[PDB]
Amino acid sequence: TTALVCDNGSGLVKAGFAGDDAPRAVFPSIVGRPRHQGVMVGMGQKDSYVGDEAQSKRGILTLKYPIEHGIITNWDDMEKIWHHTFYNELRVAPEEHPTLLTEAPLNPKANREKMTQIMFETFNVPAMYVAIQAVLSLYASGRTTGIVLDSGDGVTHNVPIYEGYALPHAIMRLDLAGRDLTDYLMKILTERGYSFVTTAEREIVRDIKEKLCYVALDFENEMATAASSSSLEKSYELPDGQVITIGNERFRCPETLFQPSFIGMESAGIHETTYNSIMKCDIDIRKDLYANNVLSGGTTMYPGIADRMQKEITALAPSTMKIKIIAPPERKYSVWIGGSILASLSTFQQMWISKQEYDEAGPSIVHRKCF
Amino acid sequence: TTALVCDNGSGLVKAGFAGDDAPRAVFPSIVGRPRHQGVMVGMGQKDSYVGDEAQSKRGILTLKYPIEHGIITNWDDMEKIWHHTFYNELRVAPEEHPTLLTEAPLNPKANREKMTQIMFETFNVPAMYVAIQAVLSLYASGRTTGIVLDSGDGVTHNVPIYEGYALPHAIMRLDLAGRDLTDYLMKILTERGYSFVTTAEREIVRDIKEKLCYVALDFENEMATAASSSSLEKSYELPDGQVITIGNERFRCPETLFQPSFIGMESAGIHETTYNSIMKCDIDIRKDLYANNVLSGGTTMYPGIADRMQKEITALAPSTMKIKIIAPPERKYSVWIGGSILASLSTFQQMWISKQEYDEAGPSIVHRKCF
Amino acid sequence: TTALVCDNGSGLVKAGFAGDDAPRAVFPSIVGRPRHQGVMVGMGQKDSYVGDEAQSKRGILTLKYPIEHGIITNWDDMEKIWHHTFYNELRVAPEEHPTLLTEAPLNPKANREKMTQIMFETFNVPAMYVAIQAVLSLYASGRTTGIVLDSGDGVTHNVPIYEGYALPHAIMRLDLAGRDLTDYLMKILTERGYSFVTTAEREIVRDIKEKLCYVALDFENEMATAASSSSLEKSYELPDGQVITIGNERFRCPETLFQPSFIGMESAGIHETTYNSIMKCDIDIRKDLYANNVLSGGTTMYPGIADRMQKEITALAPSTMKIKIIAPPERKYSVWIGGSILASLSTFQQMWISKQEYDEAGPSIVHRKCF
Amino acid sequence: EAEKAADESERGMKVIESRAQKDEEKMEIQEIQLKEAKHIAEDADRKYEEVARKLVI
Amino acid sequence: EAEKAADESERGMKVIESRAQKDEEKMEIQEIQLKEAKHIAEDADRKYEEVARKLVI
Ligand SMILES: Nc1ncnc2c1ncn2[C@@H]1O[C@H](COP(=O)(O)OP(=O)(O)O)[C@@H](O)[C@H]1O
Ligand SMILES: Nc1ncnc2c1ncn2[C@@H]1O[C@H](COP(=O)(O)OP(=O)(O)O)[C@@H](O)[C@H]1O
Ligand SMILES: Nc1ncnc2c1ncn2[C@@H]1O[C@H](COP(=O)(O)OP(=O)(O)O)[C@@H](O)[C@H]1O
Ligand SMILES: [Mg+2]
Ligand SMILES: [Mg+2]
Ligand SMILES: [Mg+2]
């Protein structure tokens, strides 16, 4: 038999079998409902479009994300998404395939308990398991030591690992992520005269952010150059026309990751939370964590983030310390690669939460030694 | 120095000297041109009628609004409007009167830049300033905290203020306003046999909306009452006769503010945007914002809007907190009163943008330390 | 003349005059700066809120503690705190009043030297003195032997004293204190879905910790009881409604004092450090030390901490030995009462550090015979 | 003018009567919670006295 | 007829805000007594918890 590795994430579901080099099912975790009347009869219209199908009909649907920040806030939509993933994207029966799921640290217990209950009751999987999204990224990188930053779409967090031993007291979790960057881009695009309010325009703004935004090495210098020169202007082609031009907003949007005060958030930038998490650890393992800084997640693909963060950390770290950042090109899918690797081990086969164990011990077995 | 105060607003222009509690000139922001040929020779009609005279000649002209939702779309009409206000209405020389201009939140910066350029280069005002509508409205209410809802004719926005400190990340802007209500009133009166298509009939439908519309505390119960009894029907006098009877359309038109799906909008009603804006703020200031909900703007003058909004917010807010909505009789002219109060302050004298400073700093002076 | 007895502590500044029975002014030691910009002009907010005033504006201010673990890190903030204490809370001019400062054992000499320099220069006090926070607590208990445990908010030290002769070699200092407990409560409240991240919410979490938390006699038995029963769950009302119920997280927060491994600390628990310090002393004075365990400080105010501590130390101590723990109702203010008693003594009048002596002997005079 | 005044008075009548009914179930809820609080307080006091006697013995 | 109706409506108004202010005062007093009941109940609960710990020890 083979195991399935499902990475719900927040807004982009990636799933596939265990023992592959890449997922074969990547689509947004969105559910759409028709908000208009519908005059044609005999059309046989469906009441809910889930997955990449809803992206094709964004002009007649309202789109809802079942996951706000890691926590699932809508369980019927999550059930629909899982059913679609298991029966149409992967086209496999879950009655004979163990499933491996991922979730962020510092996650409410109710979310995990109900996820396991849904997996065991509705789909009736024979076994399942839940793992942190940072240990998997460490697995994919081929390392065994080093602080890992996993900035996805819902939650950004750092988890330090030394020699395969985690340090739970040094874990820092932040809710600033790609969705907040999209909202800030929406807020600042009205400065030039472009208004995007409907959830259909959310995907347009997200595409603009993915295609044009980049992180500047220096903020003040680029502001001085943009205010005087005009070489930073870049045009984008809307789904119909009236192409838009973006100036300093191109690099102003991703600055929130380093200056959270832009969106009114009290917390400090990621370049400082990483340093705080490093100093939260011991004193005899800080060298390896400095020299094994690992990046992952979709949000960490802005052009120039791996240089700005290195400069900031070198400014914060002692002068006699060397700082290295590992940013593989496959940052977005690193978690799934690590999950597939972990599920491929024969040693891991004894860590599955069997159906008999769940029946004996209730939904609370998940928080026991069988993590 | 008897500084001048103006409020361009949307659909109405009101202006007057500082230190007063009432605008001296209130007239619609309408510019009209003749559309017929004219046969009488020697009278010499002018090529454009601006302001109140266009309403007198409403039956021969084509009325045009130079601003759609806050943003000016026809500038030449705006110099015409400002010239009319400064000369025909106030009979003042703007060469020695500082002018305070009121502008909506979340607008293109080119708008403010062009306003300042027009004020300084065309009328040659010694100094000027641009302020936010909501802050002036909160000045006029004699408060220092509380979320304020300013629904005029162009745009509806909520700005939360606590102890004089704004919360920009919680400022929400919605383009639903009185003009959309008038358009929906036409679209819903066309089903009774009354067709209003020309721009002159825009004014008649607006007058009907002002005179005969009210917000119901409940919708389904009110619909059941109106569908059986005939006690809700009222008659109106058109400028030539043929009385018209309006039934349930009198309270169906203002329901768009609470059910914006009527006109195809995706957003939620004002009763929900206000609650969301309150919830975006900090947890230690939500009590004062809940207990100091301030209303302003002409659109908020529907009989029964305050009670309905209070009921909806109480349904949304926790049951252990009091909800109070402040609806003074003078909601429409609150912004101008706040502007006059602000301009009369002596600590404001050093916050004017002087002519020399503007000449030194260029049109981009607006967004600098001087606001 | 009259003398002033101050107690900087960590997070709570309490001061008064010598000879009084209770401190006259007690307020948190925080400094707040407005993190927003401020739209209302003319009000002129101050740029720094100090003391209990900053508690009233938690929603527009960021709170910083000038003392982290006993030592003062920010000196301008501490100077502001002292100026506020001397000029507003007490309204007494300090140019003619000797001051009695307190500090924790095992602190850097630079802290004490800079404290003396600031007191002698900025405020020009005629005389000053620095005393150990444990000797004063022993004074306030009417004793002359027995160890004392001053577990405050920043530091937790255990100073053994026999017959008025201190034993410097048996003094044990531990940095686990109330602030770490509050941070751990923050960390474990996310387990239930409540996220408290802002510095303003630190005060709220501290309030829940003070009101609801208690120390369990047996950790495992209470774990079994809470898991099965539901009589341990109590609800707390947030400053904006939405009451929250905390169950198992009630006695987990103060367990860190007895199980320091919860927050990643390596050191042993308070009960074990007390026993180690008892056996660190001689063999002929262990009986009185066992029979005179004195508790003080704000952190020792948990309901049932004395019983658990007595049980643990009796388990550690020989079976044929008597153990008594002295926990008066006024543990929190014991240090100030002892300081007032010490300053009221007639023999103490010859131990003040005179201004002429300071000018003659430099700042290093404090570490000399004049302690 | 008279018709407008009458309509405004009727609107106020409806609003305040709705508030009055809301107040009525507020009375009901307050009464039941007051009764329950008094009952639990009395029970707590009597079991407090029993525990105190056991403590003395 | 309209004037008669308006007079009746305004008399009904005055009397209904009379009951409105009476009900306001009633809510005030019952809410206060709710506060004292809640405080005494929680005090009794914590007192029994303390004496139960004392009894078991
Ligand atoms: N090249 C890019 N530049 C900027 N942002 C990107 C880029 N690629 C992806 N993103 C952002 O990353 C998000 C996807 O994150 P993802 O890796 O799916 O997190 P998770 O797997 O936890 O859901 C998208 O919402 C998108 O906004
Ligand atoms: N008594 C009323 N009842 C209902 N609507 C009104 C009333 N008075 C004014 N309005 C609406 O308010 C609008 C005027 O808004 P206004 O206060 O002039 O905005 P601004 O001051 O920003 O120009 C008009 O379009 C009208 O439809
Ligand atoms: N009843 C209580 N239960 C639990 N913790 C308390 C209680 N009262 C005070 N505290 C804690 O004690 C701390 C105050 O300690 P304090 O004696 O002021 O220290 P210092 O003497 O160093 O200023 C506060 O931070 C608070 O969290
Ligand atoms: Mg992820
Ligand atoms: Mg307006
Ligand atoms: Mg202390």
Side-chain angles (χ1 to χ4, degrees):
Chain A
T1 185
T2 61
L4 308 170
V5 185
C6 293
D7 188 307
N8 302 303
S10 308
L12 207 64
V13 160
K14 41 197 79 69
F17 287 84
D20 301 334
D21 272 27
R24 60 173 59 87
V26 176
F27 61 95
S29 81
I30 60 172
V31 179
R33 266 96 171 185
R35 60 163 182 161
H36 286 119
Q37 208 204 318
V39 291
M40 312 265 298
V41 74
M43 193 79 164
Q45 63 84 30
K46 293 261 160 273
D47 50 17
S48 174
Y49 304 95
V50 64
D52 213 356
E53 182 179 2
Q55 277 285 110
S56 178
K57 293 181 181 180
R58 293 181 285 117
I60 66 174
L61 308 174
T62 180
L63 278 297
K64 298 273 171 263
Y65 281 93
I67 310 185
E68 270 291 349
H69 303 275
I71 297 89
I72 295 91
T73 66
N74 194 355
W75 288 100
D76 268 334
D77 285 336
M78 185 42 73
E79 192 149 323
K80 285 184 183 177
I81 280 176
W82 274 332
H83 172 85
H84 180 261
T85 302
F86 283 50
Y87 285 89
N88 300 119
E89 277 285 332
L90 278 194
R91 194 161 311 81
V92 66
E95 286 133 20
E96 61 269 15
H97 287 278
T99 303
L100 170 62
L101 301 156
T102 71
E103 65 183 1
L106 301 181
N107 206 2
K109 317 292 282 296
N111 183 10
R112 175 189 283 231
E113 286 180 353
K114 192 172 285 292
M115 181 185 328
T116 63
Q117 180 205 140
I118 290 300
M119 270 304 131
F120 268 113
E121 293 280 13
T122 305
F123 308 104
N124 198 1
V125 292
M128 70 100 73
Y129 189 84
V130 290
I132 313 298
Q133 296 180 356
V135 182
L136 302 195
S137 308
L138 212 64
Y139 267 94
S141 294
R143 264 139 174 84
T144 191
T145 302
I147 176 171
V148 56
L149 193 148
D150 196 308
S151 176
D153 197 8
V155 60
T156 294
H157 54 90
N158 321 288
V159 177
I161 296 95
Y162 179 82
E163 292 293 328
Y165 284 105
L167 307 196
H169 71 96
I171 288 170
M172 321 268 294
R173 175 170 172 171
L174 178 54
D175 288 331
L176 164 71
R179 198 92 59 82
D180 306 63
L181 293 175
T182 298
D183 291 337
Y184 185 58
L185 188 54
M186 260 181 216
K187 213 185 92 183
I188 62 174
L189 273 179
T190 61
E191 157 175 19
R192 310 190 80 100
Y194 320 118
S195 287
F196 306 91
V197 298
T198 315
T199 67
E201 269 90 1
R202 184 181 303 284
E203 322 302 320
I204 312 304
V205 172
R206 182 177 56 83
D207 291 331
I208 294 166
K209 181 174 72 68
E210 292 180 358
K211 286 190 183 295
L212 298 184
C213 289
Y214 78 100
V215 171
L217 191 67
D218 287 335
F219 195 63
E220 273 58 49
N221 298 119
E222 293 255 350
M223 279 296 177
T225 58
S228 67
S229 172
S230 194
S231 61
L232 295 178
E233 307 290 329
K234 202 161 181 180
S235 277
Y236 181 83
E237 211 275 349
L238 279 177
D240 51 61
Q242 59 266 15
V243 295
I244 63 173
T245 311
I246 301 174
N248 54 0
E249 292 89 5
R250 190 185 168 192
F251 65 91
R252 185 135 66 72
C253 165
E255 197 63 27
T256 306
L257 289 166
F258 300 81
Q259 305 281 322
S261 172
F262 284 175
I263 56 174
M265 189 174 287
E266 177 84 327
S267 65
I270 55 172
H271 73 277
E272 199 165 359
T273 68
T274 301
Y275 181 60
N276 294 353
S277 177
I278 292 301
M279 291 265 178
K280 193 71 64 65
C281 298
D282 300 330
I283 196 153
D284 60 356
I285 67 168
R286 284 175 198 173
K287 199 170 64 45
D288 293 334
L289 272 69
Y290 275 134
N292 291 289
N293 198 355
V294 177
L295 291 185
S296 73
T299 312
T300 44
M301 301 215 198
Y302 287 79
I305 184 168
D307 291 331
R308 172 78 174 277
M309 181 141 45
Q310 181 163 359
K311 178 172 68 96
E312 293 292 330
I313 295 175
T314 50
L316 283 164
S319 178
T320 175
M321 294 299 291
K322 54 181 70 65
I323 311 302
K324 190 206 193 323
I325 291 180
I326 294 91
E330 62 282 359
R331 260 163 302 179
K332 185 180 284 191
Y333 310 91
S334 180
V335 182
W336 195 94
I337 299 318
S340 179
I341 283 178
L342 176 62
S344 291
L345 270 72
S346 67
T347 293
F348 181 78
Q349 298 302 111
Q350 49 171 300
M351 304 267 180
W352 287 117
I353 299 184
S354 178
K355 186 178 177 183
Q356 173 96 60
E357 286 181 48
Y358 168 76
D359 288 331
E360 294 322 295
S364 177
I365 192 167
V366 184
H367 318 293
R368 274 171 221 171
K369 291 300 180 182
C370 53
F371 183 106
Chain B
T1 187
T2 186
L4 208 58
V5 171
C6 165
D7 187 304
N8 53 0
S10 186
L12 272 177
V13 167
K14 64 180 72 66
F17 296 100
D20 295 333
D21 52 352
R24 195 169 284 98
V26 178
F27 56 90
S29 77
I30 291 175
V31 176
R33 271 100 170 186
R35 64 172 186 170
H36 296 113
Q37 56 179 357
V39 287
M40 301 285 308
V41 171
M43 32 175 9
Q45 296 93 10
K46 36 166 166 202
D47 55 330
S48 177
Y49 301 88
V50 60
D52 209 357
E53 192 173 3
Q55 284 286 110
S56 296
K57 320 285 184 67
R58 187 185 56 210
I60 206 67
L61 303 177
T62 64
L63 310 179
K64 275 321 179 204
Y65 284 94
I67 55 183
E68 186 71 29
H69 307 100
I71 297 89
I72 296 89
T73 60
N74 198 330
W75 281 101
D76 313 308
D77 292 341
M78 261 295 168
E79 293 83 3
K80 273 211 286 284
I81 283 284
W82 274 330
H83 182 83
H84 179 79
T85 300
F86 279 7
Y87 283 93
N88 295 123
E89 286 286 326
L90 299 182
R91 271 156 288 125
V92 307
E95 289 86 4
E96 64 270 17
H97 287 88
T99 303
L100 189 151
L101 279 160
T102 301
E103 208 263 329
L106 296 182
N107 281 327
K109 294 183 175 179
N111 190 6
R112 292 158 67 101
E113 289 178 349
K114 295 192 61 45
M115 293 180 183
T116 57
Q117 175 169 347
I118 296 185
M119 294 276 86
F120 269 108
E121 270 151 34
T122 304
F123 302 100
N124 270 258
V125 288
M128 67 98 73
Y129 188 90
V130 176
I132 306 299
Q133 302 187 352
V135 175
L136 292 173
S137 170
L138 205 58
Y139 292 166
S141 179
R143 299 290 179 90
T144 194
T145 73
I147 175 168
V148 55
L149 185 139
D150 196 275
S151 181
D153 197 15
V155 65
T156 296
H157 57 267
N158 314 327
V159 180
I161 296 101
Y162 182 84
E163 292 292 328
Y165 282 108
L167 275 295
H169 63 95
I171 291 174
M172 293 180 183
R173 173 171 174 172
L174 182 57
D175 289 288
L176 183 63
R179 198 95 57 78
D180 303 68
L181 298 185
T182 304
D183 293 337
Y184 186 64
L185 186 52
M186 281 175 238
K187 192 254 188 181
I188 210 67
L189 273 179
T190 199
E191 73 184 2
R192 255 187 200 269
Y194 317 128
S195 70
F196 304 98
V197 298
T198 69
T199 64
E201 282 137 29
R202 181 71 60 84
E203 304 295 325
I204 295 171
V205 173
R206 177 186 62 82
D207 213 18
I208 293 171
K209 180 178 72 69
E210 295 180 0
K211 194 170 313 305
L212 259 58
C213 289
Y214 79 100
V215 178
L217 192 138
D218 288 333
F219 193 71
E220 303 282 43
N221 301 117
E222 192 96 20
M223 281 265 158
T225 290
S228 67
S229 171
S230 67
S231 63
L232 272 76
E233 314 212 319
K234 301 251 170 283
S235 297
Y236 184 78
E237 201 46 23
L238 302 178
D240 77 321
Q242 58 263 16
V243 291
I244 71 160
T245 66
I246 190 167
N248 57 359
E249 290 97 40
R250 61 180 300 178
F251 70 90
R252 189 144 57 128
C253 169
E255 206 67 30
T256 309
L257 291 171
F258 299 105
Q259 290 269 318
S261 170
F262 283 176
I263 64 169
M265 291 265 278
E266 176 71 292
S267 51
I270 51 172
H271 76 278
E272 199 163 357
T273 66
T274 299
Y275 166 67
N276 292 319
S277 176
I278 292 165
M279 274 267 172
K280 299 294 187 291
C281 299
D282 288 331
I283 202 166
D284 315 297
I285 69 167
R286 288 180 199 172
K287 185 178 285 185
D288 287 330
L289 268 66
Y290 270 132
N292 292 320
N293 195 353
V294 178
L295 262 54
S296 76
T299 299
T300 48
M301 298 216 66
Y302 283 62
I305 183 170
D307 304 334
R308 176 63 185 287
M309 181 155 38
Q310 178 166 358
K311 164 183 176 289
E312 293 296 330
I313 289 177
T314 301
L316 291 178
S319 65
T320 180
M321 293 177 71
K322 73 154 282 203
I323 306 298
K324 184 179 178 181
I325 288 181
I326 296 90
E330 60 279 14
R331 305 163 211 171
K332 181 180 287 193
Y333 314 94
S334 180
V335 185
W336 193 94
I337 295 165
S340 179
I341 285 175
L342 183 60
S344 61
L345 289 180
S346 66
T347 67
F348 190 75
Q349 293 322 92
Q350 63 256 13
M351 278 176 238
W352 292 113
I353 296 90
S354 63
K355 177 54 162 313
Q356 182 51 226
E357 199 175 3
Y358 169 77
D359 294 349
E360 186 180 3
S364 66
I365 183 152
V366 190
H367 314 105
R368 293 181 184 271
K369 292 292 182 181
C370 47
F371 182 76
Chain C
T1 187
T2 60
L4 269 71
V5 180
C6 179
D7 188 310
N8 286 313
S10 171
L12 262 185
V13 159
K14 61 181 71 66
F17 297 83
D20 288 337
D21 205 359
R24 179 159 280 115
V26 177
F27 60 96
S29 75
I30 52 179
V31 179
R33 262 94 170 188
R35 63 175 191 168
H36 298 293
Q37 70 276 17
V39 285
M40 293 180 183
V41 309
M43 176 87 151
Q45 287 98 5
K46 62 180 73 174
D47 50 354
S48 173
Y49 295 92
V50 59
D52 210 359
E53 169 70 11
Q55 280 286 112
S56 300
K57 325 284 185 63
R58 281 192 279 118
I60 51 170
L61 302 180
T62 182
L63 308 177
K64 300 158 281 193
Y65 284 87
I67 296 174
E68 321 286 350
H69 286 93
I71 66 175
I72 296 90
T73 57
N74 197 352
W75 284 101
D76 200 71
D77 286 338
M78 197 87 263
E79 178 174 355
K80 285 184 182 179
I81 289 280
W82 275 331
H83 172 84
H84 180 263
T85 303
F86 283 120
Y87 280 93
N88 290 119
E89 282 291 332
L90 293 181
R91 273 164 288 100
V92 55
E95 293 83 3
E96 65 277 0
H97 271 168
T99 62
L100 171 64
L101 276 299
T102 76
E103 83 163 4
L106 298 181
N107 278 326
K109 300 92 171 190
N111 187 10
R112 188 189 288 252
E113 285 179 353
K114 203 159 176 63
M115 210 196 288
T116 295
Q117 192 205 329
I118 279 179
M119 271 305 138
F120 265 115
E121 301 275 30
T122 305
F123 304 103
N124 204 359
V125 287
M128 71 95 68
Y129 190 85
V130 179
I132 301 312
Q133 290 188 355
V135 182
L136 308 188
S137 174
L138 202 60
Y139 263 111
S141 177
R143 302 291 177 89
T144 194
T145 73
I147 69 175
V148 64
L149 194 141
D150 205 49
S151 178
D153 194 12
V155 76
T156 298
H157 57 271
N158 189 358
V159 177
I161 291 173
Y162 178 84
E163 215 70 27
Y165 284 105
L167 305 199
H169 62 99
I171 293 174
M172 291 207 157
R173 182 171 144 145
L174 183 56
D175 282 18
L176 200 173
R179 197 91 56 80
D180 304 63
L181 301 181
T182 303
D183 296 337
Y184 185 67
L185 190 53
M186 271 190 204
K187 157 171 167 220
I188 64 169
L189 272 181
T190 301
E191 172 147 17
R192 283 222 171 201
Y194 318 118
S195 297
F196 297 102
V197 56
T198 318
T199 63
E201 297 162 349
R202 169 100 56 82
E203 300 295 328
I204 299 171
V205 177
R206 179 180 60 83
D207 198 1
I208 295 90
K209 153 203 159 190
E210 295 179 1
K211 281 184 171 64
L212 304 185
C213 290
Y214 79 96
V215 174
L217 192 65
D218 285 333
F219 194 70
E220 299 300 325
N221 296 117
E222 284 283 328
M223 278 314 209
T225 292
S228 67
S229 169
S230 65
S231 58
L232 293 201
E233 293 182 353
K234 287 180 72 174
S235 66
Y236 182 86
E237 177 149 319
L238 263 61
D240 64 337
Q242 51 203 19
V243 298
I244 67 155
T245 69
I246 58 162
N248 199 1
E249 296 85 48
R250 199 178 170 191
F251 54 90
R252 283 233 302 274
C253 175
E255 192 70 26
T256 306
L257 292 158
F258 298 128
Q259 299 276 316
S261 69
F262 278 177
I263 60 171
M265 294 265 299
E266 179 169 39
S267 65
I270 301 296
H271 68 277
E272 195 164 356
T273 63
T274 294
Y275 171 70
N276 292 324
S277 162
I278 288 298
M279 311 265 268
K280 187 69 67 67
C281 303
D282 299 332
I283 201 168
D284 290 85
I285 70 168
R286 282 179 199 175
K287 189 169 73 69
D288 297 332
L289 260 54
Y290 273 132
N292 287 322
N293 290 325
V294 184
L295 295 204
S296 71
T299 302
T300 46
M301 280 281 203
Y302 293 110
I305 182 168
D307 291 331
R308 172 71 175 281
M309 200 149 168
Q310 180 169 359
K311 170 185 179 292
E312 295 293 330
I313 192 172
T314 304
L316 291 177
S319 87
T320 176
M321 204 86 198
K322 66 176 75 65
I323 309 297
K324 300 163 50 55
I325 291 178
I326 296 90
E330 74 295 330
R331 303 164 212 174
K332 186 181 290 189
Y333 317 98
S334 177
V335 180
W336 193 94
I337 298 168
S340 179
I341 287 175
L342 183 63
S344 297
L345 290 181
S346 67
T347 73
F348 193 83
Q349 290 334 287
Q350 64 214 10
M351 290 206 165
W352 293 110
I353 296 169
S354 178
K355 181 176 174 66
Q356 188 269 330
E357 188 174 359
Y358 168 77
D359 288 333
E360 188 199 311
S364 179
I365 189 55
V366 180
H367 307 289
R368 264 181 261 181
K369 300 291 185 181
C370 290
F371 210 62
Chain D
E1 295 300 296
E3 186 166 288
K4 180 177 184 181
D7 281 13
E8 295 301 295
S9 49
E10 183 70 72
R11 195 159 299 142
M13 181 155 138
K14 190 189 72 146
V15 167
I16 193 66
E17 292 179 353
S18 185
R19 179 57 151 283
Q21 283 104 30
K22 183 43 183 279
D23 212 329
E24 292 294 328
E25 67 267 13
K26 287 164 87 173
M27 321 285 188
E28 304 310 305
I29 289 161
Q30 188 274 331
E31 269 173 68
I32 62 165
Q33 65 183 177
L34 181 64
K35 281 295 188 180
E36 182 65 26
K38 282 181 180 175
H39 286 90
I40 65 165
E42 292 179 295
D43 298 10
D45 296 328
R46 66 159 169 256
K47 55 178 59 70
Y48 181 76
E49 287 297 295
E50 297 183 14
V51 173
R53 307 283 79 72
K54 284 180 180 181
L55 189 147
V56 179
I57 67 170
Chain E
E1 182 182 70
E3 284 176 297
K4 182 181 185 181
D7 291 331
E8 297 170 0
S9 295
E10 73 194 68
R11 170 83 261 176
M13 201 85 168
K14 314 153 211 163
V15 295
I16 63 183
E17 69 273 15
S18 73
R19 279 82 65 193
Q21 51 92 19
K22 295 213 316 299
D23 296 348
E24 290 283 352
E25 296 160 4
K26 194 175 290 293
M27 311 176 318
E28 175 94 10
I29 55 172
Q30 65 183 357
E31 196 275 332
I32 297 169
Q33 77 178 359
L34 176 66
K35 330 301 281 173
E36 288 88 6
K38 286 286 190 286
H39 294 89
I40 193 66
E42 60 91 22
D43 183 28
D45 279 313
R46 64 140 291 290
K47 225 173 182 191
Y48 175 109
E49 294 190 42
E50 179 44 57
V51 289
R53 306 204 215 93
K54 214 167 298 179
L55 166 68
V56 298
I57 193 66

